[PDB]
Ligand binder design. Sequence first.
Ligand code: HEM
Length: 291
Amino acid sequence: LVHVASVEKGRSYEDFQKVYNAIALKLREDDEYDNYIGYGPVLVRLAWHTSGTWDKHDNTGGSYGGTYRFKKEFNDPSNAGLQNGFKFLEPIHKEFPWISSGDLFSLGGVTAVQEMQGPKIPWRCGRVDTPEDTTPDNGRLPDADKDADYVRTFFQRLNMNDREVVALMGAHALGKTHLKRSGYEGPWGAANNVFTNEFYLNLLNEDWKLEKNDANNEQWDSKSGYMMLPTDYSLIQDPKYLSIVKEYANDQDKFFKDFSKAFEKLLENGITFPKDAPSPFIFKTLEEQGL
Ligand code: HEM
């Protein structure tokens, strides 16, 4: 199965900047969500989970088909809570009904990262909705209770290497774990709706204790009130991951650049872009537009 990007008919960069802007303006307006964290983090997670079902071996799942809109995928236990991101995007989709679902879910993530002062993420259009029977089964998203070997093997299926994995995990600066959602509870840091390299700094610099939460799962906790999942902590237990964690803790610009590449790649896995497709778009933030 080849998925060829097909530009929404007649649309160009300005059309998608309008969608970006509507997302960004709602992000600003709907600021109460999740005890004033706002929707940025869950939109980033929605983009990742809608992309992260991909299997490089047969090109099943991935962002192209926008299959989260079907009940098998929106009810995946691994996706608990993402319905909030979907509901956020609904009025956006109503205003811009021409955008594909995959294009909107992925653009939500890009827009959230950038509006949270993260790196620019180049973004390409052209995902096309595919039918209900193309929805991937549950179970392709990762478990959090595992070690570095798990994480490394998991991400090979998404064609990600060690650097790409450690970079992508930096998104756990954002938002928080919610006990009723994942069986884990707590934020990873203080700046959880501003995109920074804090995840790496906290991994290295907090004093972590292995505790059980109220769902009887182990997680790493600090006196500052932060947490790390076992899979996060695995990034400092494994010496290869550890080196890269230290690199990003010590170079914010490097983290931004590597995150941007890896996140674009994640969002584009499975898609074939024709030779004459438009170049990737780099959207201006609201701030850059004076909006
Ligand atoms: C080994 C890989 C990963 C595991 C096991 C993992 C697991 C988790 C878990 C358990 C949660 C908490 C869900 C909740 O209770 O609300 C979470 C939240 C989140 N994850 Fe991941 N994650 C991984 C990779 C990633 C990647 C690659 C990204 C994106 C680049 C990402 C972005 C997020 C964000 C932004 C949140 C916060 C969501 C919110 O506040 O609503 N995660 N992750």
